[PDB]
């Protein structure tokens, strides 16, 4: 119910002066006189009836003295069951050219976190079909998962295989949010989910909703799409008692986007050129992704590590918010082993003898011990040759090399790259295969038989064919 005027335009930060009423912080404003829709968000009160705002789109063509209106509430977006199978914007606008989204409810993207007396204490295992994850770092229902890695190691392929394995066998719904990534991949995912039948253009039996904001957008938009993405999922968790899934691609762009406007807001930089409000801003958002007593949310998040440095302040302050971590490495990928999961740098919270049993626990600890012992023997071999080692050391090295190969596995979404069909392995075969190799029942086979296979039964069938073709 108030009207203002633009008095300054610098970069992506705008200042507005009000003569009648002063809108509160975290309010939405609309500019008058443009062919498209431009929205401003309040950040600070500068005194003398002035505010400093951040734009959600391009700012070219603005003129000092242009009228601005006040909406009177934070950003509101449609929500409900009519947003399944549709693509929407940061501010809730369809971008798939199929007409308006007709719902009955709206929600505000700025809320507050649940309190202490609403948390849940439950832990159950969630099997996926991947040997490394199911052996050394199991996942849990209603938990938080992180996928650390550098550039070009395989985060996106893994997050696609997780969807293909877990999402389709799930009763409930799912949400996917894309933050600061390539548009070309967002064109691929949309047409992949149509062939599989998860998204339907004729019936009303869809199961996924999509929200997108990519790396061609100004920093204002890239720092808000995640809240829009999780506001949708909160509706399916609270207003309906159902389990939900939530996938996020490169949550790192949420933090980088906030460092490109801090200087223009008048702030002194912190270490390595970050804003002084990093941890608080990260904590405010992360606390809303939880499984309260009214519903469950299972989240998978992909995190980018700049220049393969795990001590950087952005990934450093993210380990505390998770329940299970998988770390991808470039050294393993150069040997040709995929997925390039580091076996000595992954952790989980339910790796306890009282939750997964004793056999499963002993097998994993026995694998890790021999993998650690392998490293120390590689210093001796550098100076004195391979043949001067004792026979026990040679047996240790031979077993360790075979253990290393058996952790690789062909995926189903990577048939174009490798050229093989994918495989899925249950948990009991995963335990038994490593227990047998640790025992020493396959000391009469070459290494190549354990490379890119599924269960243990296929390695001997591969070795027999290799013997036949020799």
């Amino acid at each position: 119910a108030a009207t203002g005027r633009i008095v300054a335009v610098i970069g992506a930060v705008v200042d507005v002066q009000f003569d009648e009423g002063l809108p509160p912080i975290l309010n939405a404003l609309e500019v008058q006189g443009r062919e498209t829709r431009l929205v401003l968000e309040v950040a600070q009160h500068l005194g003398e009836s002035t505010v400093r705002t951040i734009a959600m789109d391009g700012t070219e063509g603005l003129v000092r003295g242009q009228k601005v209106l006040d909406s009177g509430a934070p950003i509101k977006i449609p929500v409900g069951p009519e947003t399944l199978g549709r693509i929407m914007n940061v501010i809730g606008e369809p971008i798939d050219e199929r007409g308006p989204i007709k719902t009955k409810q709206f929600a505000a993207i700025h809320a507050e976190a649940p309190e202490f007396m609403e948390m849940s204490v439950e832990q159950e295992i969630l099997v996926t079909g991947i040997k490394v994850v199911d052996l050394l770092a199991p996942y849990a229902k209603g938990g938080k998962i992180g996928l650390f890695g550098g550039a070009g190691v395989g985060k996106t392929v893994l997050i696609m295989e997780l969807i293909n394995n877990v999402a389709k066998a799930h009763g409930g719904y799912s949400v996917f949010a894309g933050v600061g990534e390539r548009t070309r991949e967002g064109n691929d995912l949309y047409h992949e989910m149509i062939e599989s039948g998860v998204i339907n253009l004729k019936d009303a039996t869809s199961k996924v909703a999509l929200v997108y904001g990519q790396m061609n957008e100004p920093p204002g938009a890239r720092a808000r799409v995640a809240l829009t993405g999780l506001t949708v999922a909160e509706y399916f968790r609270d207003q309906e008692g159902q389990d939900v899934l939530l996938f996020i691609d490169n949550i790192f762009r949420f933090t980088q986007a906030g460092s490109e406007v801090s200087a223009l807001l008048g702030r002194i930089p912190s270490a390595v050129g970050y804003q002084p409000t990093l941890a608080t801003d990260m904590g405010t958002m992360q606390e809303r992704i939880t499984t309260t007593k009214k519903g469950s949310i299972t989240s998978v998040q992909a995190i980018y590590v700049p220049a393969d440095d795990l001590t950087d302040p952005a990934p450093a302050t993210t380990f505390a918010h998770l329940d299970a971590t998988t770390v991808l490495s470039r050294a393993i990928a150069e040997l040709g082993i995929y997925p390039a999961v580091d076996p000595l740098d992954s952790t989980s919270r339910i790796m306890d003898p009282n939750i997964v049993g004793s056999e499963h626990y002993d097998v994993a600890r026995g694998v890790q011990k021999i993998l650690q012992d392998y490293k120390s023997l590689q210093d001796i071999i550098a100076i004195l040759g391979m043949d001067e080692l004792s026979e026990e050391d040679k047996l240790t090295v031979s077993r360790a090399r075979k253990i290393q190969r058996f952790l690789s596995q062909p995926f189903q979404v990577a048939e174009v790259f490798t050229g093989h069909l994918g495989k899925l392995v249950p948990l009991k075969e995963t335990i038994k295969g490593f227990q047998q190799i640790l025992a020493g029942e396959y000391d009469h086979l070459p290494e190549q038989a354990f490379y890119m296979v599924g269960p243990i039964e296929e390695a001997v069938a591969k070795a027999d064919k290799l013997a036949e073709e020799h």
Partner: protein, 495 residues
Amino acid sequence: SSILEERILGTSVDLEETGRVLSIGDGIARVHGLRNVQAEEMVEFSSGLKGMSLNLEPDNVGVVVFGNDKLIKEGDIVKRTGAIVDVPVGEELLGRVVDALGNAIDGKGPIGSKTRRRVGLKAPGIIPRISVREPMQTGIKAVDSLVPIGRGQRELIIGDRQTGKTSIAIDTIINQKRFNDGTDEKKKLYCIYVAIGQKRSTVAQLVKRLTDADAMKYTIVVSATASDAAPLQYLAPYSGCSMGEYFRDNGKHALIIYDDLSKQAVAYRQMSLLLRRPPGREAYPGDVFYLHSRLLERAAKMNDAFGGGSLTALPVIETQAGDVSAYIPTNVISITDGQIFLETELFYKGIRPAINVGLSVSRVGSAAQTRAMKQVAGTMKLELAQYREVAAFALDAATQQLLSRGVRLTELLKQGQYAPMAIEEQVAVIYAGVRGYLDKLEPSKITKFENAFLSHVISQHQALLGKIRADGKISEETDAKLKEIVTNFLAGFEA
């Protein structure tokens, strides 16, 4: 005589809005005055210079100049044109050399154009796109066989100084002649070259090299040399992308090259600091990532509802002492779809071009590649992968044979300069090596065999190549023919 009389034979004056200059120094002018002025709008000075307004403040406007500043002085007059900055576009620019704002500097004459287009526009979204399916051929043996490139992709060339980055693009531009001199329009490609920060004599030698191979008839050169003002070097790449976008929206295909993207960021940093904005890491502005992200997103492959055009990009980056984990290179590595690495140690060991095949990647999966090439390249991948893991120690059954084949395979990939090859000849020359027909000759004499065999095959067997070109794949009869040809020529070629 009468021509100049007719030129002067062909004067209206009207009111305009105006501000007055308060200060001037180091290319930045503070203007008191103009009220209804848009952000990023082009204004004009008294003498004839031009500028653009970026900072809109309560009491002044900050204007950057597109040229020299020794003529502006306090008390002058500034007028506003009323239009956001734009450049001429069309296909009358083929064969011309123009500056960053679309002015001829080659001495031919005026450019007759009918259309204009803004430099800052948004990339296509999600709906109007489609997958990448067609090949983009270069003529480099080590690229077309191990690092293929499709149409609509972005690929990075990165290395140190004096490694050979420019010659790859120069060879790629020349190779397209055999398609443009044809009949069908579905296999033609246009080229654009952009030079940022280089000196003029190098550009003159490049243009002379292009014009002696009959390649200027389908190329556009945009230059902003080291003597130009910083805003022109900052504005040059977008002005060329906007010219490339014209072909993309009319069902045609185009190629663009940004030489030394590292030299645009220094001009952006200089321009921003003089506007009194706070610095960041290494005094770079706070949003250098957004400078390139909005630029490299404009290359796309359109579907049939929009025409089917395409646009491809090839940026260039330079690193200090082979340090790939610096600030600027890490930003641009995470944007593109692949990269090609060049090294000095391989350059001095006789491996030219110095492509590191153990690190170069291409995130296309060979989806856009001819059927014939896959058969002989998929098998060379394994040979080199197994050669690298053993044959470096600073028996005869396995090891000696492995490096005996690997040393032969390495020598096949070397190539000269300013001479790209057609696809089928590469297929034949690789087919000779992979099958083992050259496991007896001493490695020192392989290159002479390659040259003589290529000349003989081109001259005496012109009908065989057409079969491979037309069919797109090898056949049993073709395979039968090639073995006899290879064995006979090997027997006869001992000199």
